[PDB]
Amino acid sequence: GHYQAEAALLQCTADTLADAVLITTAHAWQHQGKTLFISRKTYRIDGSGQMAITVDVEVASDTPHPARIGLNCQLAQVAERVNWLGLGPQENYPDRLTAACFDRWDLPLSDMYTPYVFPSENGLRCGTRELNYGPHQWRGDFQFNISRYSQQQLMETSHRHLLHAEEGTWLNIDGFHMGIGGDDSWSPSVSAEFQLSAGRYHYQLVWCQK
Amino acid sequence: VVLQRRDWENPGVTQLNRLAAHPPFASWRNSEEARTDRPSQQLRSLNGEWRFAWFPAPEAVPESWLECDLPEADTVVVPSNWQMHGYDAPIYTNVTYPITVNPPFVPTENPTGCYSLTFNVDESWLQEGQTRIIFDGVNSAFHLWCNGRWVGYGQDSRLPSEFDLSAFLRAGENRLAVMVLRWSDGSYLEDQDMWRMSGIFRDVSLLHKPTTQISDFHVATRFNDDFSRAVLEAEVQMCGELRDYLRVTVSLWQGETQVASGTAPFGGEIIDERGGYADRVTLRLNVENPKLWSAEIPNLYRAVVELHTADGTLIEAEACDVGFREVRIENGLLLLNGKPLLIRGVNRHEHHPLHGQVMDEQTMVQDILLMKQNNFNAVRCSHYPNHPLWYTLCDRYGLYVVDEANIETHGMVPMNRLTDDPRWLPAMSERVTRMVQRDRNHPSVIIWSLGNESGHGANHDALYRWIKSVDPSRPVQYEGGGADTTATDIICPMYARVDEDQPFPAVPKWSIKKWLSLPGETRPLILCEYAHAMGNSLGGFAKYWQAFRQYPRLQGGFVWDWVDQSLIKYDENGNPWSAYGGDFGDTPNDRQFCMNGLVFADRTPHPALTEAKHQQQFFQFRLSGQTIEVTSEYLFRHSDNELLHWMVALDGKPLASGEVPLDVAPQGKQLIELPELPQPESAGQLWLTVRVVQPNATAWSEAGHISAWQQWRLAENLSVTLPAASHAIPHLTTSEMDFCIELGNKRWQFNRQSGFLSQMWIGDKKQLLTPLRDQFTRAPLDNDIGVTEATRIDPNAWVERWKAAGHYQAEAALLQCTADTLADAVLITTAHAWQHQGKTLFISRKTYRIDGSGQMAITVDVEVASDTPHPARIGLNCQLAQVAERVNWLGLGPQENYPDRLTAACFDRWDLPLSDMYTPYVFPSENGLRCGTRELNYGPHQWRGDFQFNISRYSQQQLMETSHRHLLHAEEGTWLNIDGFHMGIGGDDSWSPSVSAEFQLSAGRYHYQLVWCQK
């Protein structure tokens, strides 16, 4: 029920600090009464206009290891360029990133999408410390992809030529992403060290306007 | 001429007037006594009180001593090492010779032990036949006198030296005088990593044989393809007058039932142009469906060899236990009875903490029982032939033995300087040939070894071939010169790693997986030494066993090693303590390197032993749905003394259990269907634990012995319940020096200068003696230290890397310390930096959230500079004021476990006395960690999260500063170390960094969280 799971709010609170506002949230993702994931977050917005997001995720040990542990949103902005400090320039995944180099990369948005004939998750870049797109900057230590196609559309579309650019830009920022495998393509081939099996996961992001 | 010839400084003279080697004799004069292995009247023990005087050199020994006892002499028990009575000091040196390397010479100051015994000999012994004296072990060389007359000389400390005393003895009182030298040319071949001792340290006995006697016998067992038929072949040699009426009968017995018998006159078949051996006979006995010998089922027969007249008058009988087994290498596999072995081996020295190198039956039996109870099936006689009883016990209890010649020249430069020199071939040949002559009839011995750490030389090749020629029934192995030379049937490296190559010049230690498949290579690989168990060690043990099970030609190995070579010393108050190298004034020395055991010298287990037991299990398990698949790794036996107990528990709370008898064929599988388990209402992780229990006692184990276990996570129900809202709100009070928080009878104090929780009160009683502070270091393990010395730094060693980076010197610098009041909580935020000479090593960022329920949530985020050596731990420590009796935790246990040594530990609710949370390693270090812990309870305190911890009366600082466990003093209160992350302990060896990459704390950024409350 990973694709069907609905978020149930457990906690949403707001606190004022000396120089910041602190928002704390907790969500349970459930299917047929079974809790798959729990996400505990803090959002800290300070006087500099920076939003620090802390994310702590529990994954039930008896659910299949999830494909990713991240956040997503559809941004209003459509910008021409994507700039990042991280692994690139090409698409790279945790079990396929040795060729990628850490540097400051700058590509047109279209280059951040890989036009596999059969559409799927694509265009991830790993080991990213800073990402810039339009007015936005995200900092941390994350994996990301950015495109005009939602994961839903990629999942529902059998041919690349049938894809249509959506309004704004879909951003996936992952603390963690499962291997892609490939030893063969007819049985599970993602090696154990690249499966998201740790049970508890932590990542943190800073979102600001730059 | 004795002091004039100096035979102890001549490698060309290894003995004078010594009788030929042979298998164990008792010269029974009754065949039934021989069959039952009862004491023989013809074999007398001289293990009594002897007279002993110590001398600084052989030249200082007075002439009168040969004739008359010295009044200055003391009365000492024999066998003994004289260092253990305090006559001089034992020396612990590893590689470096304890004497100047100047072959064949030894120091002029050569400690000399003068032993003497006055004893009765009955006239019957002297009227007829031959009376001989047997010295099973004299270290390192000796001259023998009887009633004032010179008998002979012997070298090689580890094999019996025998002399004919017939023409020296008189009826009534006789006197033996034995002059034992500590050092000899023999010492150059005795450079084993062990305590250097001396004396008559094994049994002394008198043996009476008839004039016409059995002088040798060899037993062989050969089989057809399916082992349903065997031929026992027994070659018997006689000494004395050859006669037509002489006969040999070899009879084979299973209990009181004779199963086969053969009789023949002397006279072997023609072998060359000059005929045959008139003084030899070969008997051949058919055995249908022989009961086969293995470590799994040590089936033994009794062979009785009778020398007798045609008419049936007995002259004498000898006997031995016979194990029907075939050892062979075929297609690159070592096979026992046609099946590929998996060696769960251990190296074992002959060591007792009180008696030194003197072995007794009780200690040998204790060792064998412990070995088998911990899933060992094999032992290497590191590095010399053992006390003869050892092989008998291995025959009977069932252990595979590697019998190893007393040859080690480690200290030579290069290592083969002597073993490649044909002038040392005679001394070497004797150590090999006389071992084979002694032990070749023991079924337990499956492999011959040419010695240890003596490089590879032409003498090894010659002696390899000699053994193959005289005894084709056993493979020959030898590790020297790179572990895969022409002098070994088995690739037998020491400390080769599983996946990591160590490409040393000339003698590389390849990854064991890689080694097998090198171009042209076909031999089996069995590590002669691996998993160096020095102190807190055996990290990565599971990696070896996974490889052993996956790769047919990886057939196991022998752990280094069985028992700590510590010695008991006494303090001013007469209290005993464990001593190592240097503690006897011995210099140069190699300190704690003599302690590499799975057990302490008194045979108390180190925690590592349980990891070995678990990884060496003979049953393998898989879970699929509600089905447990049990696979047997036994090669010969069915699981006829085995039941499977299963248990399902929710966070340590028992839910369901049951038992199922195991009926698994050797190499077979059994499916066990678990019944439907009722769903738990409450949240938490379900765990399934299985245990294999032996309902019946065995010769080696008690009823209810657990031989194997395994655990799995089952269904997990994550808690989604919101904790009941609190009525009260914590109150923050501020001064220039402190943030103070109060809630009811609880108070927390955060020092604003240091930025740490400095104190905590319950009621109004202080909970801390030292503040709660980050810790990134540990008191260095033996593996962290390696071979580094104060005078000679090994910059590669983990401890030296941490020291050079300033990890132990780094001081916390406060960057931020703020407090905020929330709706139902107080929030403290801190940031610290640890710096050394302007370099920031670590940054720790924390939040402490104290809510109305009294719980304190601590969130820690640590950055580690990528270019600093990876830290030993990422955690917190404090000294608690409380000393409580018990420690209760939900996590891995019950024993000490570390990230690379936790497979044997089980997740459950454990409750131990505080003392059990400390491991008394003789050399103190970080110890007692328990990993995978979700809840820890101590006095009124509870910590929850996902952490590793240790808890004791000793600070890391004291453990770090103190060299011996007996010098440790319990500090005030209790030191708690709670780690989000802890480095591996390693142990592939203990002289180079051995912690695998996956167990190094190299992630750069680390996060962990703890809740601290009162229950």
Ligand SMILES: [Mg+2]
């Ligand atoms: Mg690279």
Ligand SMILES: [Mg+2]
């Ligand atoms: Mg000599």
Ligand SMILES: [Mg+2]
């Ligand atoms: Mg050595």
Ligand SMILES: [Mg+2]
């Ligand atoms: Mg396990």
Ligand code: NA
């Ligand atoms: Na698709």
Ligand code: NA
């Ligand atoms: Na194997």
Ligand code: NA
């Ligand atoms: Na050692």
Ligand code: NA
């Ligand atoms: Na059974």
Ligand code: NA
């Ligand atoms: Na120490």
